[PDB]
């Protein structure tokens, strides 16, 4: 009758059919990773063909609900999500164009590559050696020509049938399957309600600016000291306002100073309390990491891998005819017994992910174990950084010293103080900016404001200026490489990390000293705090009537992200920082430059 009653008989059968059928799909995938066939491709052959069909015809066959007379959140959102359709949104010819788009390089995007013509001798696999260079790479012309190389070859290997998919869907994207590129998303963060319930639009962004615009000196001398190291290894020229390429240290990443870590190990003379050496002093291992590290990290009682699963599980990367990787894989079924399986290498980070990957599931259940389609989350920026964020949140140094790792060496004596203390500071800080502007482009990219027409001159000049920031040769718009992003292909946005990280600092803060722990203000606590558990059930997370404020937070924590106990942590930073990073200057004056 109502949306609940019609969708409820629908879901008593539809949990069954969708859950069960994608479930057969998952079991078939597992039977595949047992043994490889085409039968195994859509079954993993019949089931993936059946399942892609199944969802699109589920659209086609239950696409029958309106929206207009709704004054309530769950009904509204549920019904918009229901009316969201597959294989059936718009008219005939353009959607046939669309389906061939989607499936056709949904295949060819994996199938596409090529070779090199330079020296007529060979063109074969390239992975391992450059990955060893990734792990130990500090070299000069390597940096330059490697970025040039790889972000020059990706182009026309993406462009043919992603030309069809992303590019042709991209002119329609200039009419993007919605309206387009500006305000029709500049009109959505104000949630569909009025006067008392729904969100604001500017507080988080303004405090982000207030944070970064003077966090910049942390860039200054943190990157100054790892600049002394990076330019005693890296290219050729020292002044304050320079210019570097990045990409192949052997391959992409080269991200953090915590990534440049291995020259700069945690504890020098005495062995670090470091899981390998210190937990082999504490008699702990790898097959033992699975079992004996249920014990050794999660002595609190990791969920059992199910018994027959333990028997059948050839757990590591098989290396036999089976070509699988236990890069974290999860299984979950439900069906009135609460069952969860996961591939997890339980470290102490993994402690935190055991705890709040059950917690990340708790989020998921909050949008995946409520009544079937009343299973709705908090916000859009809340889906996988939910695992990453409150892993980093659940970091609890002296709680796990009650478990036994960190000694109280948080001291101040110049050189090794610099190393130890600013290295934990190094991690806790990190950096914002081009992620910032790209995500801003996405939000400001849903109604239509982007110029198109006067192609060669406008696009050339626009292109030069917009790229601007150095790469040895441009990786860029007019010579169209750039739109290869995995975060657009599989949709893993990064502002997710941001909003949950705000949540992180506050709620973490009251998580590891205030439920009444031993020590400082960083240190947050929940020790013997069933009471914390209920006040998590209690004062942030229920909805948007009185909000995200109301059913976990205003006891577990509060709203914004801050650095205040981290400022007791980080005042040495800002002072040392000011004092010597004069060899790095604000913006660019183009006259002085290390890397130029």
């Amino acid at each position: 009758s109502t949306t609940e009653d019609l969708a409820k008989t629908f879901l008593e059968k539809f949990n069954y059919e969708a859950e069960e059928l994608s479930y057969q799909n998952s079991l078939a995938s597992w039977n595949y990773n047992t043994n490889i066939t085409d039968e195994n491709i859509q079954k993993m052959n019949i089931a993936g063909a059946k399942w892609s069909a199944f969802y699109e015809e589920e659209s086609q066959h239950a696409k029958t609900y309106p929206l207009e007379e709704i004054q309530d959140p769950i009904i509204k959102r549920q019904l918009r999500a229901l009316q969201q359709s597959g294989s059936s949104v718009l008219s005939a010819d353009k959607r046939e164009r669309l389906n061939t788009i989607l499936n056709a390089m949904s295949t060819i995007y994996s199938t596409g590559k090529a070779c090199n013509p330079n020296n007529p001798q060979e063109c074969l696999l390239l992975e391992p050696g450059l990955d060893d260079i990734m792990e130990n790479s500090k070299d000069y012309n390597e940096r330059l020509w490697a970025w040039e190389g790889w972000r020059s070859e990706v182009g026309k290997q993406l462009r043919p049938l992603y030309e069809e998919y992303v590019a042709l869907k991209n002119e329609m994207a200039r009419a993007n399957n919605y309206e387009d590129y500006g305000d029709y998303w500049r009109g959505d963060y104000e949630e569909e309600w009025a006067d008392g319930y729904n969100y604001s639009r500017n507080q988080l962004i303004e405090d982000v600016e207030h944070t970064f615009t003077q966090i910049k000196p942390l860039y200054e001398h943190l990157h100054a000291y790892v600049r002394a190291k990076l330019m005693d290894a890296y290219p050729s020229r020292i002044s304050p306002t320079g210019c570097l390429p990045a990409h192949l240290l052997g391959d992409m990443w080269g991200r953090f100073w915590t990534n440049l870590y291995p020259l700069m190990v945690p504890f020098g003379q005495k062995p670090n309390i470091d899981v390998t050496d210190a937990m082999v002093n504490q008699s702990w291992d790898a097959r033992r990491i699975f079992k004996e590290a249920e014990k050794f990290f999660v002595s609190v009682g990791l969920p059992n891998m199910t018994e027959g699963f333990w028997q059948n599980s050839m757990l590591t990367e098989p290396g036999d005819n089976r070509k699988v990787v236990c890069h974290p894989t999860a299984w979950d079924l439900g069906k009135h017994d609460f069952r969860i399986k996961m591939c997890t290498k339980v470290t102490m980070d993994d402690f935190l992910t055991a705890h709040h990957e059950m917690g990340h599931i708790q989020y998921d259940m909050a949008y995946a174990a409520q009544p079937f389609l009343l299973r709705n989350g908090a916000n859009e920026g809340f889906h996988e950084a939910v695992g990453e964020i409150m892993s980093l949140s659940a970091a609890t140094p002296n709680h796990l010293k009650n478990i036994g790792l960190l000694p109280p060496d948080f001291s101040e004596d110049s050189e090794t103080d610099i190393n130890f203390l600013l290295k934990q500071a190094l991690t806790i800080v990190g950096t914002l900016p081009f992620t910032y502007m790209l995500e801003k482009w996405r939000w400001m990219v849903f109604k239509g404001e982007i110029p198109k027409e006067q192609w060669m001159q406008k696009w050339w000049e626009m292109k030069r200026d917009i790229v601007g920031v150095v790469e040895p040769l441009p990786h860029d718009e007019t010579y169209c490489d750039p739109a290869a992003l995995f975060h657009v292909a599989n949709d893993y946005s990064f502002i997710r990390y941001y909003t949950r990280t705000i949540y992180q600092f506050q709620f973490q803060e009251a998580l590891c000293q205030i439920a009444k722990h031993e020590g400082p203000l960083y240190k947050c606590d929940i020790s013997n705090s069933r009471e914390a558990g209920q006040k998590l059930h209690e004062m942030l997370s229920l909805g948007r009537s009185k909000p995200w404020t109301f059913a976990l937070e205003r006891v577990v924590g509060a709203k914004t992200m801050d650095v205040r106990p981290l400022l007791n942590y980080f005042e040495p930073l800002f002072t040392w920082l000011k004092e010597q990073n004069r060899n790095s200057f604000v913006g660019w004056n183009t006259d002085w430059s290390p890397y130029a």
């Binding site: 069954y16 079991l27 009135h336 017994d337």
Partner: protein, 174 residues
């Protein structure tokens, strides 16, 4: 292996013959003695069923089962053997053979039979042989993959009473 259903509750009349004939749980009438209780003549409510709903096998229930197939009366009292049947009825091919009804048309009391098996519409559709647009069938199948946990997995479901009956019993000593 197969059982007469909740509607087919069978007179396996397990009584009236000379008495020459697995974790325990306890709710009801005085358990801790054997001979005096009254087992008189038995129509058997017994089938392999889900195990999750043992809390709904209890006084005063509300849910899918209680609303549309069966609820248990508020005077359900008994101490029985709550024990699983995993190794027996945790299949591997996928088992839909066990049939559970989805909706019930009349508020009924326990202990009788209803076999309405006409092509049963649950909605406004005059279902003229074409399913869809709110078309249904009376009985619905289960589905049992190689891994069904204790919820849908059947216990050997002794979640019963030693119900109080009418006639002379058949259990005694010397």
């Amino acid at each position: 292996t197969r059982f007469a259903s909740v509607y087919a509750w069978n007179r396996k009349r397990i009584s009236n013959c000379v008495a020459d004939y697995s974790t325990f749980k306890c709710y009801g009438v005085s358990p801790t003695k054997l001979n005096d209780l009254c087992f008189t003549n038995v129509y058997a409510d017994s089938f392999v069923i889900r195990g999750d709903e043992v809390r709904q096998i209890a006084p005063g229930q509300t849910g899918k089962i209680a609303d549309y197939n069966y609820k248990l009366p508020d005077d359900f009292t008994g101490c029985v053997i709550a024990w699983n049947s995993n190794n027996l009825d945790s299949k591997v091919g996928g088992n839909y053979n066990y049939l559970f009804r989805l909706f019930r048309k009349s508020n009924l009391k326990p202990f009788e039979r209803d076999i309405s098996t006409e092509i049963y519409q649950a909605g406004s559709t005059p279902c003229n042989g074409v399913e869809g647009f709110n078309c249904y069938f009376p009985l619905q199948s289960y589905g049992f993959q190689p891994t069904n946990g204790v919820g849908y997995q059947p216990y050997r479901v002794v979640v019963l009473s030693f119900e109080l009956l009418h006639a002379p019993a058949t259990v005694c000593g010397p």
